[PDB]
Amino acid sequence: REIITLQLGQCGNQIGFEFWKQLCAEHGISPEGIVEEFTDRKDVFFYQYIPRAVLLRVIHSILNSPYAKLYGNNWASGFSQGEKIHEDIFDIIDREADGSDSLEGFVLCHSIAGTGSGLGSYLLERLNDRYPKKLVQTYSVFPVQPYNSLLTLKRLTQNADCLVVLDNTALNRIATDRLHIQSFSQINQLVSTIMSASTTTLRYPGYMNNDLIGLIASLIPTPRLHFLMTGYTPLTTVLDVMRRLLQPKNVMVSNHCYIAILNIIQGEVDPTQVHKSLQRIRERKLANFIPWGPASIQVALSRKSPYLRVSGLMMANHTSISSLFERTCRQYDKLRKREDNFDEMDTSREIVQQLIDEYHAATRPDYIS
Amino acid sequence: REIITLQLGQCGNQIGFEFWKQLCAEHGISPEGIVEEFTDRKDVFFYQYIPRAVLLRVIHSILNSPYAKLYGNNWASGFSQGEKIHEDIFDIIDREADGSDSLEGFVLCHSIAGTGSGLGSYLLERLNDRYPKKLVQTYSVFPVQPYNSLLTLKRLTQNADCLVVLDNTALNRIATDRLHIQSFSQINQLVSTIMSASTTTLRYPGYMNNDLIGLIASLIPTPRLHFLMTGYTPLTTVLDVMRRLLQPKNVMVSNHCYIAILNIIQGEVDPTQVHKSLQRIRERKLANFIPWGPASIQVALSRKSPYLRVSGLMMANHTSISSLFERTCRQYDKLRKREDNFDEMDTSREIVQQLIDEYHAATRPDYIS
Amino acid sequence: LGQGDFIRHLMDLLKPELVRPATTLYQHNLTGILETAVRATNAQFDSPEILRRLDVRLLEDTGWDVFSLDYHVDGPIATVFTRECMSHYLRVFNFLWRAKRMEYILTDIR
Amino acid sequence: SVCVMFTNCMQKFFEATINKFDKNFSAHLLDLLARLSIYSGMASVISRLDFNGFYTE
Ligand SMILES: Nc1nc2c(ncn2[C@@H]2O[C@H](COP(=O)(O)OP(=O)(O)O)[C@@H](O)[C@H]2O)c(=O)[nH]1
Ligand SMILES: Nc1nc2c(ncn2[C@@H]2O[C@H](COP(=O)(O)OP(=O)(O)O)[C@@H](O)[C@H]2O)c(=O)[nH]1
Secondary structure (H helix, E strand, C coil), X not given: CEECEEECHHHHHHHHHHXXXXXXXXXXXXXXXXXCCCCCCCCCCEECCEECXXXXXXXXXXXXXXXXXXXXXXXXXXXXXXXXXXXHHHHHHHHHHHCCCCEEECCEECXXXXXXXXXXXXXXXXHHXXXXXXXXXXXCEECCHHHHHHHHHHHHCCCCCCCECEEHHHHHHHHHHCCCCCCHHHHHHHHHHHHHHHCHHHHCCCCXXXXXXXXXXXXXXXXXXXXXXXXXXXXXXXXXXXXXXXXXXXXXXXXXXXXEEEEEECCCCCCCCHHHXXXXXXXXXXXXXXXXXXXXXXXXXXXXXXXXXXXXXXXXXXXXXXXXXXXXXXXXXXXXXXXXXXXXXXXXXXXXXXXXXXXXXXXXXXXXX | CEEXXXXXXXXXXXXXXXXXXXXXXXXXXXXXXXXXXXXXXXXXXXXXXXXXXXXXXXXXXXXXXXXXXXXXXXXXHHHHHHHHCHHHHHHHHHHHHHCXXXXXXXXXXCEXXXXXXXXXXXXXXXXXXXXXXXXXXXXXXXXXXXXXXXXHHHXXXXXXXXXXXXXXXXXXXXXXXXHCCCCHHHHHHHXXXXXXXXXXXXXXXXXXXXXXXXXXXXXXXXXXXXXXXXXXXXXXXXXXXXXXXXXXXXXXXXXXXXXXXXXXXXXXXXXXXXHHHHHHHHHHCCCCECCCCCCCEEEEECCCCCCCCCCCEEXXXXXXXXXXXXXXXXXXXXXXXXXXXXXXXXXXXXXXHHXXXXXXXXXXXXXXX | CCCCHHHHHHHHHCHHHHCCCHHHCCHHHHHXXXXXXXXXXXXXXXXXXXXXXXXXXXXXXXXXXXXXXXCCCCCXXXXXXXXXXXXXXXXXXXXXXXXXXXXXXXXXHC | CHHHXXXXXXXXXXHHHHHHHHHHHXXXXXXXXXXXXXXXXXXXXXXXXXXCCCCCC
């Protein structure tokens, strides 16, 4: 099962270009697409080695970079031009699909803040037409700006089978708090750390989680509550790492309860005190979950690349993600009272309200019905 | 169990900063809050190491110190400003309380002589509102000064669960008598030694006195009589230390009888002769006790810090402490006849009159009812 | 009970359990509580060998009448204790357990 | 059996059968934790099955 990734807009290119650089080094692969001599499953993202990427003036910046041998501002402009090249970019994706053994997903990296917003809205619609059995995960990045942002949310709430939020605001704080930057060339270094460590269980096979649909169906219980946030502590036992992930200082997000937690421990820590920490987290009650359904916390170990110390990443499905929407929803109405049908915006307006209500209904002891 | 400390006003910050220096040096903790190589239970006062302090100009001189890596004048003016930042400072406490395993109490270091004294009186009441099951011990320090002193007394008699008095007039006389200073940073050396010695049986565990209520439950007979005084002799057999503590020259206080006594011997003394000395001190009748209920004297050993000889501290409950309130009381009346309602001063003046009336009636054979 | 720091936490965790009658008490549940106390208090920094022998036993009412520690010892060291010191320590441990709950009751009332 | 069979029902794409699996599977699960608890790890498994205090019946 192979995962063909997409990169749209200046954001998607820059994070993806730095995502591949983090992966190319984590394996024994020279930037010349040649394996270095110097066990790790590398057939998911690389094709025997060439990465399975379909990019879409930053492109020239990549073609001049040493990695050259490895391959307007309106939302309407993005959706319009995307229709004019419907056959062009689908020729590439189709020829890249059948050449692969068995396609599994479409990890799409785009920012909802110019053309990446309108084009990505076009793709996520068109993929569900032709490919109805392919998961579509998206590493969307949060920042007329209120308009282009929410319009993509209309598509991301009914097409994308998963979504990982990464807002530049909360990232900029961690850029200022523990890195003291005051730049895009620095915050993306943290984004590339989150994207690479997200698929560490696919590239390093273990007891479980050997396929993308194994990481998805565990967290996302229902087709609607499909938004996830991340947590990465290393910026020492398993109890030291588990306690730091639950602190609000580490989450990349600016009653409320969790739905499902998955912990990624990339250390060489002994797997005997693992259950002891989970036992302790239950006692001190450092996190609460949904009251209606049985919600449990899962922890997964892996092995660090010898070619490159305990780290940790947490995939979270938290109801407090509804706050980020309200900030978008709020500024929209203000721009709606300040200035061929203008119905798509209002129709998108309604469905976002259905989503936020579903979150605030998820924290109720009677979320069923 | 853990104990969170608060430091209010210029005095609280200074004596608290000197309390933490002495407590860090007593343990194996570098000024950089890192454990040096070089048994002592330190989880109560240190967090995994981080002190559980809540500091409230002087802060800058603390931050310019080598210990930076370790974290008007009216009573009404000090009360109001605390009301406008009511929500602010509690967020620091609310996260530290819930971040704590099992909270036990609130140590308060403050001087009642004026923004800090006013802020203290405000916080002492709110802690009774939110947390009903947490002890509040206050290491108050005695000196428009008569006004502020009695107002905070109105709160310290019904809010603070315990209280240890330390008056400057007794400390200043000691510095000129046995230290010959003729400064604030000089007398605080003695205050730090008494504070560090007060919680000695908490950090070095023994068969008894493993919790803050264990020391207080013996001395304070009724919730009204919750005032204590101290005695520190070395400025050697155990019989020598007991006899030197019961002399008036050592007490830090400028008929009457004792209610309960606690002795802390911190040396390497022979622990077999400790029960002998209490047999003979009773015979000479060096102290007169209450006639209504039974009372005795308590001696508790500990171990000095090896990383840094016999010492001794005596916590007593003497009804002669009523005289100190009398001085503030009489000083208030003289100013009241000399110069929106001025009714709070009337209630405070009245309630402290009942406290004094309890003491003078606490020495009679019919204190019952 | 010469530790004091460990027995304090151990009396706070057995409170919700021992209040029930002895019929609903089963040994397999308390061991997880004892193991939790040895981890939280200062008794964690200790020789792993001696911690392997420290367990619980159920005397044969209320949960405050059938709980007691055992610290079984077998091998060469068992020639110093000889099954009589272990039948005397438990005879002592009751008097130190009672005089310890009769105190934590009286500091709760206070 | 009720887990794998429920996958077959959903694979045939009724409303009175989904609720029929619920009362049948939830009853079978409660028989497990009843026997897994009665013993002298075999006890830490319960802490893995429920984490939110659910199935406290
Ligand atoms: N996190 C992150 N976000 C970026 C970076 N570069 C651009 N963005 C986001 O992308 C948005 C601009 O998109 P834009 O380049 O105009 O899209 P285009 O019109 O297709 O070129 C901004 O709002 C940024 O938030 C980056 O290096 N890191
Ligand atoms: N015991 C003791 N008391 C102090 C010390 N420093 C200040 N004080 C007391 O604090 C009072 C002055 O309070 P001040 O700092 O002016 O209040 P603020 O201006 O509201 O912080 C004096 O009456 C002193 O008795 C100290 O180092 N030790």
